[PDB]
Amino acid sequence: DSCIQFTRHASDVLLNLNRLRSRDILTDVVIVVSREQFRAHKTVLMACSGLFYSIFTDQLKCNLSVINLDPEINPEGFCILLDFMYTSRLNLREGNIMAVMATAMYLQMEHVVDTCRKFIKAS
Amino acid sequence: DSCIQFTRHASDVLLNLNRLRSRDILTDVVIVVSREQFRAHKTVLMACSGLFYSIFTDQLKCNLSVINLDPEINPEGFCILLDFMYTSRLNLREGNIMAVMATAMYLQMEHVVDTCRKFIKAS
Amino acid sequence: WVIP
Amino acid sequence: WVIP
Ligand SMILES: CN(C)c1ncc(Cl)c(Nc2ccc3c(c2)CC(=O)N3)n1
Ligand SMILES: CN(C)c1ncc(Cl)c(Nc2ccc3c(c2)CC(=O)N3)n1
Ligand SMILES: [Cl-]
Ligand SMILES: [Cl-]
């Protein structure tokens, strides 16, 4: 086409979606990880995760307001990944990298799994 | 912080949100413009437009499944702007620039209004 | 704004 | 991936 493009548009959209999440505006699901609860937007979860994409395209699960993750999933690993989904920023540290990689493999977040594998190989 | 960042993350999120829109997955509102109907995600509309942001943060309007725009709004101008919201790409042409600018002013999309003003000043 |  |  003959379109023009606004370079910062996608980043600005994601920043506003994170602002809505922080104020709990139009969040439509709670993700339960052990005792911890995380409110989010189903569309953002689907856009970032192969697992959530499969869950919310399912004719029955698409209507659930609560999703319980596998008990092996670490709440901190999930929190770091949920923050990444809404910001593009990953808080990857020596103390959390194993929990982050395991959670990203479960959530099917291919790019996160790739950077975790590379950071582990380097050490 | 000590975060790492995935450059293409915001663009990839927006691409997936557009894929959901095209398949009509988890759309929660219909925007009525004259006779024309446009299905969308409230969160994406809010993230892109000062007008939708005001509408869906309103305790009563946040629950509406149908929003009717002012009858002066041109459906083609709206369609071009809705496509921009989900792609960062604006189909700005000599034949639509006046309708696009008027719709962007009404929707409160400051960056679109700015490029329309500059393109008009050049001609 | 750019030419994509 | 980059250092932001
Ligand atoms: C694959 N596809 C057509 C599609 N459409 C819409 C959405 Cl929201 C979506 N999201 C999704 C699927 C798989 C994966 C991801 C997002 C991230 C990932 O690493 N794998 N994937
Ligand atoms: C201003 N603010 C705190 C905020 N938080 C969340 C959202 Cl979704 C939002 N969106 C919004 C508001 C005003 C404008 C836009 C988006 C685009 C624009 O040109 N003006 N604005
Ligand atoms: Cl990823
Ligand atoms: Cl804009």
Q: How far is CA B27 from CA A3, A5, B3, B43, in A?
A: 25, 25, 33, 10
For residue B69, the enclosing domain spans: 1-123
CB pair distance less than 8 Å for A115 and D1 = yes
Which of A65, A2, A1, A79 minimizes the C-alpha distance to A33? A79
- Assess contact for A86 and A13: CB atoms under 8 A: no
b/e sequence A32-62, b meaning 16+ C-beta within 10 Å: ebeeeebebbbbbbbbbbebbbebbeeeeee
Number of structural domains in chain A: 1
Query: What CATH number corresponds to the domain at position B78?
Result: 3.30.710.10
Give me the resolution in angstroms, 1 decimal: 1.9
Mutate which of B53, B112, B116 for ligand 2 pocket (most atoms within 8 A of beta carbon):
B53
Going by the DSSP 8-state scheme, the letter that residue C2 receives in this structure is B
DSSP class per residue in B39-101? EE-HHHHHHH-HHHHHHHTSTTGGG-SEEEPPTTS-HHHHHHHHHHHHHSEE---TTTHHHHH
CA B99, CA A33: separation in Å to the nearest integer?
A: 48
Provide residues with CB under 6 Å of ligand 1: A 46-50, 53, 108-110; B 16, 19-20
Tokens at B63, concatenated: 């629950």
Chain A nearest-CA distance from B67, in A, is 16
From chain D, the residues in CB contact with A90 under 8 A are 1
